[PDB]
Ligand SMILES: O=S1(=O)CCCN1Cc1cccc(F)c1
């Protein structure tokens with residue numbers, strides 16, 4: 018048995034599992050299946066540990082997984098993340114979004130700006146207004162207006178209703194649909210669908 | 217898009233990933249690649265969470281993974297396991313070994329008896345003789361002899377040298393070779409090897 022060739026076959030299969038789990042993560046995020054998203058996320062994270070060298074395409078795939086993971090935890094309150102990252106899940110999603118090797122088109126700016134406002138608004142929704150001000154300081158006349166809204170706990174201001182959570186999710190979901198179409202034809206899902214269609 | 221058929225394709229692919237990760241877990245255990253075993257174990261555990269209904273063959277596969285996992289942690293000292301299971305990894309491997317749907321042949325008895333003695337000997341090797349006596353009580357003139365050996369801290373007694381750790385590992389490795397031959401032809405590894413052979 019050639020250990021080198023076995024390790025190569027295992028790397029090929031890890032690459033296939035990564036695409037399959039990204040495809041599944043995208044669908045669960047689109048569908049709102051939280052528990053399924055959490056399980057697929059755990060599987061993708063474990064499979065990714067089995068890879069030590071990634072191609073440009075594989076790096077793009079893992080960063081999309083990390084990005085959707087932070088967006089899904091935007092409203093969740095976990096100190097462990099605040100202990101290590103020292104920022105909020107949505108601020109962490111913003112850092113990933115701005116460094117993915119992808120086109121900075123109109124949809125990229127829309128998603129970026131919605132995450133920027135929602136990183137502040139989710140803290141206000143949770144009643145943590147000191148945190149909302151800290152998030153504002155780390156990200157940013159516009160600044161004066163936005164700071165007055167936070168100071169006045171004006172959570173339901175028309176600005177927040179235009180730059181809403183639902184609007185952020187809809188725009189991110191539209192981007193996820195493009196990822197889903199690109200990967201819908203990857204090896205593992207395509208072979209899995211052919212078995213189900215044969216039955 | 218039919219959600220039911222997509223979920224079925226995902227179940228088919230989870231089944232393939234399970235066989236692939238079992239195959240990889242078996243090879244890492246056989247080869248002594250500890251870090252690779254730990255990563256494959258984490259991947260198999262995550263993939264298994266994505267399955268809610270398992271066939272008789274799939275249950276056999278997950279129990280082989282659990283069995284090898286306990287054997288690998290036989291000498292490791294972790295209270296969390298002792299907190300939940302309240303037993304030692306090797307006693308836990310013994311419970312799994314005796315309930316896998318498999319033939320109770322000569323090799324099954326050999327492995328069982330080697331695990332039984334090694335669950336005691338690994339505690340003596342770690343200097344925990346009170347624990348070795350507690351393990352002995354939970355598992356078991358033979359008992360009087362074995363208890364005298366533990367009481368006298370006679371770790372290197374000829375009985376322990378015949379029922380050694382190395383002998384336990386060699387017998388378990390021979391069983392793992394049979395598992396490896398049965399699964400060496402599963403879909404994911406077979407398709408992965410064909411890609412590497414083509415290059
Ligand atoms: O980025 S992380 O903080 C590293 C620990 C898991 N986090 C999210 C994640 C989800 C899915 C795949 C992945 F590589 C990473």
Ligand SMILES: O=S1(=O)CCCN1Cc1cccc(F)c1
Nearest residue numbers: 257260261264278281282285286
């Ligand atoms: O049996 S456990 O205590 C459940 C938590 C993980 N443990 C070992 C394991 C390894 C690999 C696959 C599996 F299903 C289980």
